Amino acid sequence: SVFAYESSVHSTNVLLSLNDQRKKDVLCDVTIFVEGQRFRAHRSVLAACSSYFHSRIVNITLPEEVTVKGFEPLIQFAYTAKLILSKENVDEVCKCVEFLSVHNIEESCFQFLK
Amino acid sequence: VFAYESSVHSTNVLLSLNDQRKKDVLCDVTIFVEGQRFRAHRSVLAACSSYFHSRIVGQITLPEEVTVKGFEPLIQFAYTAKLILSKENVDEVCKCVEFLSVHNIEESCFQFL
Amino acid sequence: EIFEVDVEIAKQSVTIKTMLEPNVNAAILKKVIQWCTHEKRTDDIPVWDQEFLKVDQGTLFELILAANYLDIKGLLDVTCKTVANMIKGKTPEEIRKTFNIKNDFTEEEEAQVRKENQWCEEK
Amino acid sequence: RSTFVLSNLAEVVERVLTFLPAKALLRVACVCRLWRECVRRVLRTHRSVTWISAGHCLVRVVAEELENVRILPHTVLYMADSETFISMETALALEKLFPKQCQVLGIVTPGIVVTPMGSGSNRPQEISGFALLFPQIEGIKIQPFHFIKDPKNLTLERHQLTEVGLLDNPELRVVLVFGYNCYLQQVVSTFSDMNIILAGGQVDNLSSLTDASGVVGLSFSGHRIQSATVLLNEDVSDEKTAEAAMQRLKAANIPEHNTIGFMFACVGRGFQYYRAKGNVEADAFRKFFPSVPLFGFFGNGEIGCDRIVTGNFILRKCNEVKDDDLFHSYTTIMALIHLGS
């Protein structure tokens, strides 16, 4: 007889903890330079979320096409599994997701406000 | 202000990190348990334990009190969110989870069996 | 105003303890002092309080107001138990004639409210 | 000043109407607009389950005790022992005794385990009947699903299960499944592979659902249910073993507030099983739980495994066969349903 303790809150707790580490800049590994502005993140989480960063990593300088306004919510979404959107930045976040190939997000959310 | 709530992003990211450590890519922490090597991340191990948070922050060999048979299920839980108990390692896993004070594990899983 | 010196008569009260750390000065505080000295089914009402509340309806309502102002949970609970006991077993029309409550409703609103809750009329 | 007190002080009216039972509450609902708001808001606080036991006896007993019930039921649950109920006239009488919108579930079983009404601390007994009046709790969404044995059809379409809230439901926590005149295995195994607590058994017949065979049960949907289950198998045969397994169950740390302990026993065990003793599982349950009223039956077969489902974790045994873990016989199943707070 072999049992298996399954936890439904471990993944969310780990994500919240990682967001705490990123906010406090403790055990942050990857620095991203977008429009001359520096962003701290974890290499593992970035490679896990987006396949673009997964290929790039395996000091990232994002291309001039993307914008800080379209990338800042994406880091919070990656580290918290929740995305905050507005009327001005909906298209920015949409094309940022398309360029970065971020997984687990739904394009229906973008198209609802489009 | 449509605030989308992904219901699989946490689990999917944790499983991606588990695959990452299984392929031994991007890991930066080596754990020596009874002479056995385990590859993991600083952030993931710190974020799922209290002892690991203390030792890793500010910089790993676990003391003799930790057995490999008791640490394989714990790292499997810390990277996959599910912990597997057998009738042989249940006591060792309980001792290791009492030592490390691993989060998100309820002790009810040990005596209730 | 004509308040008894001992603090044990106000320990049960909650409102006084706010500014410690008055409605009217009629016999209501005397009744409150007497009460202080001596499932949520109301059939287990104590005999002393039941026989002590034999005052008229107006005095009972004044005591209810005084207890609510004083935040005395026990006295408010006892008075509400008495009111519910004297309410039980009476149809809404009987209650309204007893309490002289004017009707501010309309006939189809009454029809739909007594239709929506029609399980109770069964025996 | 008489009308002023009940027409301007809403708190006084609320506290007065709190002592009014649900039937008189709905009587006085139409007194006035303020009284209507007061009765609705008092109904909003009616979240506790209430049971009307009967130490037929129960059908009239609830008829006497329906005037002292402080809640308005939505999903009534009731059970009755075999030879007292058996005879659909009594089932219809109990059907017409409940509100039209109130879905009613009724079971006939060889045995009945029930504690005296009023307080859950009372020592339960084994055998009559009882009742369980689940109100319209916020969040919890119990739905008494029923699946009858079709003569020609044998498969169960997915729309049938999704409509009754079994599948396509990420919130379902406890499924209580009973089988009468036993198709039970196929229905259970249809949703046995979920992260839910499955507890139940084999019963005689179904009384009320607003002969034949099938699966009758309830789906305790909602995100605040935290349950647990143990299997007092053949290794438990005396008081000490039963108390040890009860300690094992208590280790699950299921809250005792708004909680029912469903004992899903076997008809073939009990006084004839335990050597020179009776009421061993009920006594142990009351010892380790001085609350949590003990209900269930003495079923022909048992459905359940040692599982712990809460809002934070699931502790399920890993099995080679998905449905071999659940179905049992000559065992005991002490499910612990908790309906949030």
> Could you tell me which chain B residue has the CA closest to the CA of D246?
B112
Give resolution, Å, one decimal.
3.2
Neighbours of chain D (3+ CB pairs under 8 A): A, B, C
Domain-by-domain residue ranges, chain C?
1-122
> Could you tell me which chain D residue has the CA closest to the CA of C74?
D15
- Backbone phi, then psi, for B2, in 5-degree steps? -80, 105
Q: Which of A1, A2, A6 sits opposite D314 (nearest CB)?
A: A6
H or E element in which residue B35 lies: none
Q: What is the largest CA-CA distance in chain B?
A: 54
Q: Are D333 and D301 in contact (CB under 8 A)?
A: no
Cβ contact (<8 Å) for A10 and B103?
yes
Measured CA distances, C30 to A90, C18, C35, C38, C91 (Å)? 70, 22, 9, 13, 35
Chain D nearest CA to B107, separation (Å): 8
Residue with tokens 């689990």: B11
In chain B, residues 66-105 whose CB comes closer than 8 Å to chain D: 84, 104
Domains and CATH numbers, chain B: 9-111 (3.30.710.10)
Domain-by-domain residue ranges, chain D?
2-44, 58-338
Chain B nearest CA to A49, separation (Å): 6
Chain A nearest CA to B11, separation (Å): 5
Query: What whole-number distance in Å separates Cα of residue B50 and Cα of residue B40?
Result: 16
Q: What is the 3-state secondary structure (H, E, C) of C4-41?
A: CCCCHHHHCCCCHHHHHCCCCCCCHHHHHHHHHHCCCC
Q: Which residues of chain D approach chain A closer than 8 Å at the C-beta?
A: 195, 311-318
Residues of D in contact with B83 (CB under 8 A): none
Query: What whole-number distance in Å separates Cα of residue A106 and Cα of residue B8?
Result: 11
Q: Which of C58, C84, C91 sits opposite D16 (nearest CB)?
A: C84
Q: How far apart are the first and last CA of chain D?
A: 39
Cβ contact (<8 Å) for B17 and A48?
yes
Residues of B in contact with A58 (CB under 8 A): 25-26
Q: Which residues contact D318 (CB under 8 A, 6 or more apart)?
A: A2, A3, A4, B84
Q: Which of C80, C91, C110 sits opposite D15 (nearest CB)?
A: C80
- Chain center to CA of D117: 15
Bridge-partner residues for D114, per DSSP?
D125
Chain A nearest CA to D274, separation (Å): 27
Query: What whole-number distance in Å separates Cα of residue D49 and Cα of residue D68?
Result: 14
Q: Per the structure block, which two tokens stand in for D87?
A: 């005879």
Cβ contact (<8 Å) for A3 and D314?
no
For D340: left if phi > 0, alpha if psi spans -120 to 50, otherwise beta; the answer is: left
CATH, domain C1-122, list 1.20.120.160, 3.55.50.30, 3.30.710.10, 2.40.160.40: 3.30.710.10
Q: Which residues of chain A approach chain B closer than 8 Å at the C-beta?
A: 1-15, 17-18, 21, 26-27, 29, 42-45, 47-49, 57-58, 77-78, 81-86, 103-106, 109, 112-113
Residue D302 exposed, middle or buried by CB count within 10 Å (0-12, 13-18, 19+): buried
DSSP A23-72: HHTSS--EEEEETTEEEEE-HHHHHHHBHHHHHHH--EE--TTS-HHHHH
Q: Where are the beta strands (DSSP E) in D110-225?
A: 113-114, 125-126, 129-135, 146-148, 174-180, 197-203, 205-209, 214-220
Angle at D148 between CA D147 and CA D154, to 5 degrees: 95
Cβ contact (<8 Å) for D313 and A4?
no
Mapped onto helix, strand or coil, the DSSP state of residue D122 is coil
Q: Are A77 and A83 in contact (CB under 8 A)?
A: yes
* Disruptive mutation site among D229, D307, D315, D318 for chain B (greatest number of B CBs within 10 Å): D315
Cβ contact (<8 Å) for B111 and D251?
yes
Whether residue A9 lies within 8 A of chain D, CB to CB, comes out as yes
Residues of B in contact with D251 (CB under 8 A): 107-108, 111-112
Residue with tokens 């042989």: B88
